[PDB]
Amino acid sequence: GSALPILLDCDPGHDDAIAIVLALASPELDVKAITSSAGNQTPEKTLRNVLRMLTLLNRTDIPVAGGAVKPLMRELIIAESGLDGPALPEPTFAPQNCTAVELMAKTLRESAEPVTIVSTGPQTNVALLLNSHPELHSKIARIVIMGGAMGLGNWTPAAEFNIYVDPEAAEIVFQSGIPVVMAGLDVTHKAQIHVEDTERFRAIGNPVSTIVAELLDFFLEKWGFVGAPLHDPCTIAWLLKPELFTSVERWVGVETQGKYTQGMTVVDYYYLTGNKPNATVMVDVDRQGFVDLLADRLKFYA
Amino acid sequence: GSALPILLDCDPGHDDAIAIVLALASPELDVKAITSSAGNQTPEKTLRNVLRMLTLLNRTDIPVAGGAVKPLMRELIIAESGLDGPALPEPTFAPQNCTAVELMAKTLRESAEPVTIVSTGPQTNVALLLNSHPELHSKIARIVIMGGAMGLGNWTPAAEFNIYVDPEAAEIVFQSGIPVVMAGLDVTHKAQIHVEDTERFRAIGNPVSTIVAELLDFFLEKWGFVGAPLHDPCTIAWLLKPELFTSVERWVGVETQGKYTQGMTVVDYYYLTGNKPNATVMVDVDRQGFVDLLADRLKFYA
Amino acid sequence: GSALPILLDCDPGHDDAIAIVLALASPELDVKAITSSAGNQTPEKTLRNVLRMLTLLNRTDIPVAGGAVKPLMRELIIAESGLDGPALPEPTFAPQNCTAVELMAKTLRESAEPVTIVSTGPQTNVALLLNSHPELHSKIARIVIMGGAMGLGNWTPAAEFNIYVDPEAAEIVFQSGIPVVMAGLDVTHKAQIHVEDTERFRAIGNPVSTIVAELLDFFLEKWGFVGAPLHDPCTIAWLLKPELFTSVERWVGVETQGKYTQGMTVVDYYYLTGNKPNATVMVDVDRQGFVDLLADRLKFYA
Amino acid sequence: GSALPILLDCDPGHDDAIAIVLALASPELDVKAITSSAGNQTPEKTLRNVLRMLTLLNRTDIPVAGGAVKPLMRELIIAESGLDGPALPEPTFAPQNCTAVELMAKTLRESAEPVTIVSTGPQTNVALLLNSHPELHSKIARIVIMGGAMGLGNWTPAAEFNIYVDPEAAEIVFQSGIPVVMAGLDVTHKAQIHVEDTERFRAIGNPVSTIVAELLDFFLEKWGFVGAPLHDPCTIAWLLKPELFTSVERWVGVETQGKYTQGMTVVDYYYLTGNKPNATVMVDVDRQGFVDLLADRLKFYA
Ligand SMILES: OC[C@H]1O[C@@H](O)[C@H](O)[C@@H]1O
Ligand SMILES: OC[C@H]1O[C@@H](O)[C@H](O)[C@@H]1O
Ligand SMILES: OC[C@H]1O[C@@H](O)[C@H](O)[C@@H]1O
Ligand SMILES: OC[C@H]1O[C@@H](O)[C@H](O)[C@@H]1O
Ligand SMILES: [Ca+2]
Ligand SMILES: [Ca+2]
Ligand SMILES: [Ca+2]
Ligand SMILES: [Ca+2]
């Protein structure tokens, strides 16, 4: 029958690109559209990068649209192409002549079943969709994000990059009443790709496994990591094999006003507030299992 | 030739309704659509009220769409129909099968010239349009709002109602780079309709002038007002006869974080900041001239 | 209140252009869109001509779309710009990024009341609308055409030009079950503009009355006419002042198969068939009254 | 990579339904939409039948739209549900809120590559698409029809049913300049399913192979057939395995005017006219190979 319908919103970005690769190697998922957010790079670059990845993967049938050019209430800060390392093809196809929100809305309207949204850059497009289309909330099964940290941030002391870029958009997502699943730094810093794992991917032997290895190569070349955290593919991996993860439901609030804490995801892990949980927070992963999943799925491109 | 194209976004609301009446009596203006915001009443009620007013005025040709159901990042607070007083007709037509933002976007796309947006409730729809359609900013001539106060607020000590309902949306408007014109309480509290003026409107003698009088009657039945301030029609009046007003260009910022000041419009009247002006702020009005304008235009419905 | 909503489909064409002028000088009518058919000239030229006329008339607010590039089942035959004579402005605006049928459909969907279609070239676009949008038939009040002849044709012995170009499309219109009103050659050959009438239009003295005179000049420079028949404006004139015309309801069939009669409108004037009437056929006009109407309306452009 | 994109337009109809089954069991094909034509049954029934088949097959992700309610220029004639025999599920999903032509156009616009149209009922929707969207012809790779007969007809002496229902639409398709491939009665009368073949399908053992057998059962219960011709699946079979067929390129004209020959496909097999070929005409099939293909593909539903 039909697969699980998903909308992927992202800002490639090496790990976003690997998330695309993993999703497209997974027949359990039906990627309905890919839209670009601005974060890792400027909106022109993230859009171009989605197109190049879909060109590489011979999935020009998936509609693409460029999203918001900046955060809701803040100027854009960025992380020279945004996908440096491998030689990638020029796009062989054009994005749709609409915005990301328009393409997401069209998908939700057209759909006969609730759609899962996966957003692995700043939450700007997702927030705009939620606020502008209250009539389509019933068509959203859940929103699976890469962003936030119960613990320390990777951009400012308290904040992870994606949330920091657009804290207001993230807060809108968490306040929306739609189930939210969060792959924060607590899980992604455990999802490390060691040099031996990149070697393993390279040894798979096909052009896509090679490109994935090259993407991983370039990024790697105080945190105390053995290998590089591979953040965005944790969202897709969780959809495919949730048994690889430990996840808890807690209340999460995004700080938008603090002097020293803008963009922090405040997670009420110990039930200190009266707040009902609004998110599933990933807190652990079987790292070898995660690597095994990526390696197995890369055989799709043989 | 063609008139000045406008998009009217509002939350009727007695003064919003009078603003509709004034706009539709003015051949210099071409009202392209009317959309409803939530503020004065719930979104179902403000939508119904737009429809009832257009039914009354025999302008069922103007497309109508309901907007956002709540503020961007806040729960809705409201000011039992929202237009109490006169007996109004049930709607004879349906709203468009799209959202307010969709209808605004379609208008801007279709337009051969920049369109003036007039927004007299909370700025929620306008902000969603600005953020979701960066490609359409060049199609927006200016945004004329009723909201804010250089001086004291009418809802909280520092904040006027429309801005207070959605401070984030108002801030997005003021930060947008599109010319903004503000009819705040500084001007609207001067735009008082005295009992003698309502008598004058009633003496015009047609069904619409009568309804306007009834709307004014009901609202009237510490501020030190002689008559009731008629806020929202100041936006339309400024478009028709700017010579009735004194306006200055200053920097305006909307407070979104303060303990005691959320929703305040902070106006740098005395050039104390380094900030370049982003708004035209109305600070005075020829009150009798404003009343004369309304009375003259009401003859349209003879 | 609101005016009579119309969709104008045409192939300018000097008389089509004069029909546009007359319609836009008439506040009783609300021209919702103008679309171009191919007939008098190629589809690129008729589209350009609509745009030039709307530019001249300062009505760039009326949306324009190009229609079908050829007849349904036949190659295009045409009557070097298609509006030769006057110097006309280059367009200052673009057509909509949709087809004529799409623009007509959007209009009908958006409308709160049945819309009158006026089609003064071949019926190609109208037929495509009727067949492709059966759900919108209830939104069409009537279809007013310029085309056909109860008597002799002006293109082949039995056929008038517009019907001859696309007989199948015309037959679809007449078979549609929507009220059809026909300004055929029986009426239009009586609607002659004499040299003295063109002088009168020229003496009105404004740039548009001058252009109309120039259009009439050029066309004029066996039929036994005193002046040139002004065909297409008879449709608009009938909407404005039906009392200027004598019209009868009869059955009309369009010949699509005959050896010698393709494109003939067969009118059962004497009730010789069992067929129920499907059209209002204009058979007479008060010519001076028609000229008076045009001259009076041209004062609009003073 | 991505599969071959197709638009399926059909009027189920037992063989149309089997064509849907075959297409959805074939990963080489990406069915972008299914639209309904009127022919075998009324338009309400063919639409319902598409929905029931997609419900059965768990492919509610494929968008569906109802098409034209009657032939272009003729009243509808039909072949009590239109899919009698098996118990089928009620639809679990709704058709799109647009017409067939609108859905086809949207698909063609959105597509990054030319799309193959397969039409197995009357050509009404396809013709409307071709005439109304000349700008999208370059997005149509080819049109594969079931219809016509080089030899004798199955509805009137000279005409096959699908062409007879709408000869004008078929003629528009053949005149369009887009490559046309025709599975006429010459091939479909050879594509017979014997009782032993239905037994074989039934022995495959899954719910879908069972339903296919039931559909074949009911239809069977002067022509000189051993088994029932299975017409519409020949189009899909030709796309999957053209080596099963013998096909020739010849000129084909559809008769629309004849006294005794309306709806005939006139095939210039012996090059007697000066006309350049406009169609690929299927003239032979490896019947056992065709049955083998259906049986192999039915294993998809195990
Ligand atoms: O902080 C993690 C995020 O930063 C970006 O660099 C990655 O794409 C990821 O989504
Ligand atoms: O505070 C003024 C605003 O409050 C509302 O009651 C009016 O409609 C006006 O827009
Ligand atoms: O035959 C009359 C028609 O021919 C065209 O030349 C005119 O525009 C008119 O519509
Ligand atoms: O004549 C063959 C056609 O008739 C219909 O009954 C079938 O579905 C097929 O498409
Ligand atoms: Ca990312
Ligand atoms: Ca208001
Ligand atoms: Ca004409
Ligand atoms: Ca069929």
Side-chain angles (χ1 to χ4, degrees):
Chain A
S2 50
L4 181 81
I6 76 160
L7 283 164
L8 179 57
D9 182 78
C10 60
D11 64 334
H14 300 69
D15 60 327
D16 301 84
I18 297 166
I20 293 168
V21 170
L22 178 61
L24 270 47
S26 300
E28 307 98 312
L29 311 176
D30 177 13
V31 177
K32 303 309 287 174
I34 302 178
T35 52
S36 53
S37 54
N40 266 323
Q41 259 299 346
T42 56
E44 299 86 352
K45 284 181 185 169
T46 57
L47 175 57
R48 168 170 163 79
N49 288 346
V50 172
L51 297 169
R52 295 198 294 164
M53 288 305 302
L54 284 174
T55 294
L56 172 74
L57 298 174
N58 291 303
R59 292 299 309 277
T60 69
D61 61 300
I62 299 170
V64 173
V69 297
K70 66 180 281 299
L72 301 181
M73 297 187 73
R74 298 178 188 238
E75 292 307 313
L76 187 61
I77 60 132
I78 51 158
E80 67 212 299
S81 82
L83 273 189
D84 313 290
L88 294 167
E90 286 306 296
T92 51
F93 74 109
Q96 298 297 298
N97 295 303
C98 67
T99 65
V101 171
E102 280 173 327
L103 181 54
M104 294 172 135
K106 176 197 273 157
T107 300
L108 295 181
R109 267 198 255 281
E110 192 179 314
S111 191
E113 68 182 291
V115 175
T116 291
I117 295 169
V118 179
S119 43
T120 59
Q123 292 302 320
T124 312
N125 295 323
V126 182
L128 288 169
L129 175 67
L130 298 173
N131 282 161
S132 61
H133 286 290
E135 83 286 356
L136 297 176
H137 286 206
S138 62
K139 285 281 186 81
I140 304 168
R142 68 194 61 91
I143 301 162
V144 186
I145 77 163
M146 188 285 131
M150 176 165 62
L152 294 163
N154 64 353
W155 195 255
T156 60
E160 177 279 331
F161 177 74
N162 288 343
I163 311 296
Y164 188 78
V165 168
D166 198 340
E168 288 82 15
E171 175 67 347
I172 288 159
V173 169
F174 281 99
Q175 286 178 344
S176 69
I178 292 148
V180 172
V181 178
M182 179 186 144
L185 299 178
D186 320 277
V187 77
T188 65
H189 282 175
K190 295 172 183 272
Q192 292 174 35
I193 302 301
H194 298 181
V195 288
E196 291 84 12
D197 304 316
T198 298
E199 286 177 64
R200 181 189 174 180
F201 298 155
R202 198 165 246 121
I204 290 164
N206 68 62
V208 177
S209 56
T210 287
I211 291 288
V212 167
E214 290 181 2
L215 290 166
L216 290 162
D217 274 0
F218 217 72
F219 186 71
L220 194 61
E221 78 169 286
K222 58 205 191 173
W223 306 101
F225 296 151
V226 180
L230 183 59
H231 316 270
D232 300 347
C234 289
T235 54
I236 304 299
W238 180 87
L239 287 169
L240 294 173
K241 311 280 191 189
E243 68 263 36
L244 296 172
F245 298 88
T246 299
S247 323
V248 297
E249 271 184 66
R250 297 295 188 274
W251 177 81
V252 182
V254 176
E255 181 62 52
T256 57
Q257 304 181 345
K259 185 182 172 161
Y260 296 137
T261 48
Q262 315 275 35
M264 176 175 180
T265 49
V266 176
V267 184
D268 184 23
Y269 189 80
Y270 295 110
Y271 310 101
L272 303 179
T273 72
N275 304 332
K276 295 170 180 191
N278 59 349
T280 294
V281 181
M282 301 187 213
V283 296
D284 209 358
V285 62
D286 169 5
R287 189 195 71 79
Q288 192 57 64
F290 170 73
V291 172
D292 289 352
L293 178 62
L294 291 152
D296 182 69
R297 291 309 165 110
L298 283 173
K299 306 203 262 164
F300 179 88
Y301 301 101
Chain B
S2 50
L4 181 81
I6 76 160
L7 283 164
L8 179 57
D9 182 78
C10 60
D11 64 334
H14 300 69
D15 60 327
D16 301 84
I18 297 166
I20 293 168
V21 170
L22 178 61
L24 270 47
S26 300
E28 307 98 312
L29 311 176
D30 177 13
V31 177
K32 303 309 287 174
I34 302 178
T35 52
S36 53
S37 54
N40 266 323
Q41 259 299 346
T42 56
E44 299 86 352
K45 284 181 185 169
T46 57
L47 175 57
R48 168 170 163 79
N49 288 346
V50 172
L51 297 169
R52 295 198 294 164
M53 288 305 302
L54 284 174
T55 294
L56 172 74
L57 298 174
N58 291 303
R59 292 299 309 277
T60 69
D61 61 300
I62 299 170
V64 173
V69 297
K70 66 180 281 299
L72 301 181
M73 297 187 73
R74 298 178 188 238
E75 292 307 313
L76 187 61
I77 60 132
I78 51 158
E80 67 212 299
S81 82
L83 273 189
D84 313 290
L88 294 167
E90 286 306 296
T92 51
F93 74 109
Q96 298 297 298
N97 295 303
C98 67
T99 65
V101 171
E102 280 173 327
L103 181 54
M104 294 172 135
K106 176 197 273 157
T107 300
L108 295 181
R109 267 198 255 281
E110 192 179 314
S111 191
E113 68 182 291
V115 175
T116 291
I117 295 169
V118 179
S119 43
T120 59
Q123 292 302 320
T124 312
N125 295 323
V126 182
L128 288 169
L129 175 67
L130 298 173
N131 282 161
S132 61
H133 286 290
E135 83 286 356
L136 297 176
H137 286 206
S138 62
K139 285 281 186 81
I140 304 168
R142 68 194 61 91
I143 301 162
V144 186
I145 77 163
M146 188 285 131
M150 176 165 62
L152 294 163
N154 64 353
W155 195 255
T156 60
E160 177 279 331
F161 177 74
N162 288 343
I163 311 296
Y164 188 78
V165 168
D166 198 340
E168 288 82 15
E171 175 67 347
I172 288 159
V173 169
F174 281 99
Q175 286 178 344
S176 69
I178 292 148
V180 172
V181 178
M182 179 186 144
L185 299 178
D186 320 277
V187 77
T188 65
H189 282 175
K190 295 172 183 272
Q192 292 174 35
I193 302 301
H194 298 181
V195 288
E196 291 84 12
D197 304 316
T198 298
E199 286 177 64
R200 181 189 174 180
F201 298 155
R202 198 165 246 121
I204 290 164
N206 68 62
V208 177
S209 56
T210 287
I211 291 288
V212 167
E214 290 181 2
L215 290 166
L216 290 162
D217 274 0
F218 217 72
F219 186 71
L220 194 61
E221 78 169 286
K222 58 205 191 173
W223 306 101
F225 296 151
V226 180
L230 183 59
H231 316 270
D232 300 347
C234 289
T235 54
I236 304 299
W238 180 87
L239 287 169
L240 294 173
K241 311 280 191 189
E243 68 263 36
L244 296 172
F245 298 88
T246 299
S247 323
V248 297
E249 271 184 66
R250 297 295 188 274
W251 177 81
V252 182
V254 176
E255 181 62 52
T256 57
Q257 304 181 345
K259 185 182 172 161
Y260 296 137
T261 48
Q262 315 275 35
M264 176 175 180
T265 49
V266 176
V267 184
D268 184 23
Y269 189 80
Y270 295 110
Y271 310 101
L272 303 179
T273 72
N275 304 332
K276 295 170 180 191
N278 59 349
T280 294
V281 181
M282 301 187 213
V283 296
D284 209 358
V285 62
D286 169 5
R287 189 195 71 79
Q288 192 57 64
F290 170 73
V291 172
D292 289 352
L293 178 62
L294 291 152
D296 182 69
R297 291 309 165 110
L298 283 173
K299 306 203 262 164
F300 179 88
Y301 301 101
Chain C
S2 50
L4 181 81
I6 76 160
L7 283 164
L8 179 57
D9 182 78
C10 60
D11 64 334
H14 300 69
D15 60 327
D16 301 84
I18 297 166
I20 293 168
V21 170
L22 178 61
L24 270 47
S26 300
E28 307 98 312
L29 311 176
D30 177 13
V31 177
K32 303 309 287 174
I34 302 178
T35 52
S36 53
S37 54
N40 266 323
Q41 259 299 346
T42 56
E44 299 86 352
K45 284 181 185 169
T46 57
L47 175 57
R48 168 170 163 79
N49 288 346
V50 172
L51 297 169
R52 295 198 294 164
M53 288 305 302
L54 284 174
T55 294
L56 172 74
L57 298 174
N58 291 303
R59 292 299 309 277
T60 69
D61 61 300
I62 299 170
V64 173
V69 297
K70 66 180 281 299
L72 301 181
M73 297 187 73
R74 298 178 188 238
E75 292 307 313
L76 187 61
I77 60 132
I78 51 158
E80 67 212 299
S81 82
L83 273 189
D84 313 290
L88 294 167
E90 286 306 296
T92 51
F93 74 109
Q96 298 297 298
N97 295 303
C98 67
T99 65
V101 171
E102 280 173 327
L103 181 54
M104 294 172 135
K106 176 197 273 157
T107 300
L108 295 181
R109 267 198 255 281
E110 192 179 314
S111 191
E113 68 182 291
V115 175
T116 291
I117 295 169
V118 179
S119 43
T120 59
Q123 292 302 320
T124 312
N125 295 323
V126 182
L128 288 169
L129 175 67
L130 298 173
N131 282 161
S132 61
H133 286 290
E135 83 286 356
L136 297 176
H137 286 206
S138 62
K139 285 281 186 81
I140 304 168
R142 68 194 61 91
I143 301 162
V144 186
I145 77 163
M146 188 285 131
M150 176 165 62
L152 294 163
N154 64 353
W155 195 255
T156 60
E160 177 279 331
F161 177 74
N162 288 343
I163 311 296
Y164 188 78
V165 168
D166 198 340
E168 288 82 15
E171 175 67 347
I172 288 159
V173 169
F174 281 99
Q175 286 178 344
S176 69
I178 292 148
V180 172
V181 178
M182 179 186 144
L185 299 178
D186 320 277
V187 77
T188 65
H189 282 175
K190 295 172 183 272
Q192 292 174 35
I193 302 301
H194 298 181
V195 288
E196 291 84 12
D197 304 316
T198 298
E199 286 177 64
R200 181 189 174 180
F201 298 155
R202 198 165 246 121
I204 290 164
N206 68 62
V208 177
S209 56
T210 287
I211 291 288
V212 167
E214 290 181 2
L215 290 166
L216 290 162
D217 274 0
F218 217 72
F219 186 71
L220 194 61
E221 78 169 286
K222 58 205 191 173
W223 306 101
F225 296 151
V226 180
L230 183 59
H231 316 270
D232 300 347
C234 289
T235 54
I236 304 299
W238 180 87
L239 287 169
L240 294 173
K241 311 280 191 189
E243 68 263 36
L244 296 172
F245 298 88
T246 299
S247 323
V248 297
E249 271 184 66
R250 297 295 188 274
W251 177 81
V252 182
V254 176
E255 181 62 52
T256 57
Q257 304 181 345
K259 185 182 172 161
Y260 296 137
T261 48
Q262 315 275 35
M264 176 175 180
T265 49
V266 176
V267 184
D268 184 23
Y269 189 80
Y270 295 110
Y271 310 101
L272 303 179
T273 72
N275 304 332
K276 295 170 180 191
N278 59 349
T280 294
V281 181
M282 301 187 213
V283 296
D284 209 358
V285 62
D286 169 5
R287 189 195 71 79
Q288 192 57 64
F290 170 73
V291 172
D292 289 352
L293 178 62
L294 291 152
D296 182 69
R297 291 309 165 110
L298 283 173
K299 306 203 262 164
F300 179 88
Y301 301 101
Chain D
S2 50
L4 181 81
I6 76 160
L7 283 164
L8 179 57
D9 182 78
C10 60
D11 64 334
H14 300 69
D15 60 327
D16 301 84
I18 297 166
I20 293 168
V21 170
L22 178 61
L24 270 47
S26 300
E28 307 98 312
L29 311 176
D30 177 13
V31 177
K32 303 309 287 174
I34 302 178
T35 52
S36 53
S37 54
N40 266 323
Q41 259 299 346
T42 56
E44 299 86 352
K45 284 181 185 169
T46 57
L47 175 57
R48 168 170 163 79
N49 288 346
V50 172
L51 297 169
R52 295 198 294 164
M53 288 305 302
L54 284 174
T55 294
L56 172 74
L57 298 174
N58 291 303
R59 292 299 309 277
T60 69
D61 61 300
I62 299 170
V64 173
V69 297
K70 66 180 281 299
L72 301 181
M73 297 187 73
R74 298 178 188 238
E75 292 307 313
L76 187 61
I77 60 132
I78 51 158
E80 67 212 299
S81 82
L83 273 189
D84 313 290
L88 294 167
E90 286 306 296
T92 51
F93 74 109
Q96 298 297 298
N97 295 303
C98 67
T99 65
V101 171
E102 280 173 327
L103 181 54
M104 294 172 135
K106 176 197 273 157
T107 300
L108 295 181
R109 267 198 255 281
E110 192 179 314
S111 191
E113 68 182 291
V115 175
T116 291
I117 295 169
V118 179
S119 43
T120 59
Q123 292 302 320
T124 312
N125 295 323
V126 182
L128 288 169
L129 175 67
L130 298 173
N131 282 161
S132 61
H133 286 290
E135 83 286 356
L136 297 176
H137 286 206
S138 62
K139 285 281 186 81
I140 304 168
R142 68 194 61 91
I143 301 162
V144 186
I145 77 163
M146 188 285 131
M150 176 165 62
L152 294 163
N154 64 353
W155 195 255
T156 60
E160 177 279 331
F161 177 74
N162 288 343
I163 311 296
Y164 188 78
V165 168
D166 198 340
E168 288 82 15
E171 175 67 347
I172 288 159
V173 169
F174 281 99
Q175 286 178 344
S176 69
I178 292 148
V180 172
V181 178
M182 179 186 144
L185 299 178
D186 320 277
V187 77
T188 65
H189 282 175
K190 295 172 183 272
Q192 292 174 35
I193 302 301
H194 298 181
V195 288
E196 291 84 12
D197 304 316
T198 298
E199 286 177 64
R200 181 189 174 180
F201 298 155
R202 198 165 246 121
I204 290 164
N206 68 62
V208 177
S209 56
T210 287
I211 291 288
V212 167
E214 290 181 2
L215 290 166
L216 290 162
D217 274 0
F218 217 72
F219 186 71
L220 194 61
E221 78 169 286
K222 58 205 191 173
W223 306 101
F225 296 151
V226 180
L230 183 59
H231 316 270
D232 300 347
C234 289
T235 54
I236 304 299
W238 180 87
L239 287 169
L240 294 173
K241 311 280 191 189
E243 68 263 36
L244 296 172
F245 298 88
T246 299
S247 323
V248 297
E249 271 184 66
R250 297 295 188 274
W251 177 81
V252 182
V254 176
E255 181 62 52
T256 57
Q257 304 181 345
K259 185 182 172 161
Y260 296 137
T261 48
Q262 315 275 35
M264 176 175 180
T265 49
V266 176
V267 184
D268 184 23
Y269 189 80
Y270 295 110
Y271 310 101
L272 303 179
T273 72
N275 304 332
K276 295 170 180 191
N278 59 349
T280 294
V281 181
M282 301 187 213
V283 296
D284 209 358
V285 62
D286 169 5
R287 189 195 71 79
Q288 192 57 64
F290 170 73
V291 172
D292 289 352
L293 178 62
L294 291 152
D296 182 69
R297 291 309 165 110
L298 283 173
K299 306 203 262 164
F300 179 88
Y301 301 101

